[PDB]
């Protein structure tokens, strides 16, 4: 829901879900053209922490 | 109309779709002017060892419903009787008893 002004005051769970989906899309891209082990280990580790 | 003679028609379209349009090339240009030696003469021999079916001249074009061999109509696929009973029903689009 927005506030008086109009800027949407967004919840915290939308930040959490949007982070997990951004990282998951990056990791899938790192499965198609993909990239070396160290890269996908950091990518999966950032998804795990997300 | 003689269900065996319907079954004899359906096996002839299969053989015409397996051999010919693919083995009509032996008569297409290998019966045309080239090295017209025994290479040509072998090919004129080599299409009789195909079945006596599988040529499109063996196909009769019977009716799609009744299988009646005479009175066929190659716009609809029916005989002249089965096109008339259908048209007066309204099974065939844009057709009517017309006069000019």
């Amino acid at each position: 829901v927005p506030l008086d002004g109009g800027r949407f005051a967004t919840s915290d769970l939308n930040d959490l879900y949007r982070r997990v989906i951004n990282r998951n899309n990056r990791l899938k891209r790192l499965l198609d053209l993909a990239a070396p082990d160290i890269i996908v280990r950091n990518e999966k580790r950032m998804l795990q922490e997300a | 109309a003689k269900q065996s003679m319907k079954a004899r028609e359906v096996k002839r379209v299969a053989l015409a779709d397996k051999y010919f349009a693919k083995r009509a090339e032996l008569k297409a240009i290998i019966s045309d002017v080239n090295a017209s030696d025994e290479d040509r003469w072998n090919a004129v021999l080599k299409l009789q060892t195909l079945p006596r079916d599988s040529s499109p001249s063996r196909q009769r074009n019977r009716c799609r419903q009744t299988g009646r061999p005479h009175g066929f109509l190659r716009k609809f696929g029916l005989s002249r009787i089965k096109v008339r009973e259908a048209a007066m029903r309204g099974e065939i689009p844009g057709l009517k008893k017309a006069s000019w």
């Binding site: - | 716009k75 002249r80 689009p93 844009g94 057709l95 017309a98 006069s99």
Partner: protein, 98 residues
């Protein structure tokens, strides 16, 4: 710029349907040549009606297919989608050649 050639069996349908195919164009493209009729193909099949002898009783049939042209003027992307993608009237052929 784009020939719109459309075919159907009914004349009251193909000519009704050509009114909105320019109303979906002149609303946006705002320039069409005009509704051009085309000479109709009348295919006749006169054939016997009895299942045996009496080959003098035949019934004359005729299937009339009509053709119309509007040949829209303006090739602006808006008009293109408003005709190519927006095809209406089932039972009416319409074929386009840009």
């Amino acid at each position: 710029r784009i020939r719109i050639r459309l075919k159907a069996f009914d004349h009251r349908l193909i000519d009704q349907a050509t009114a909105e195919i320019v109303e979906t164009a002149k609303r946006t493209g705002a320039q069409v040549r005009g509704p051009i009729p085309l000479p109709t193909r009348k295919e006749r099949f006169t054939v016997l009606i009895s299942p045996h002898v009496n080959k003098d009783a035949r019934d004359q049939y005729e299937i009339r297919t009509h053709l119309r042209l509007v040949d829209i003027v303006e090739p602006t992307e808006k008009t293109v989608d408003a005709l190519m993608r927006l095809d209406l009237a089932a039972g009416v052929d319409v074929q386009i050649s840009l």
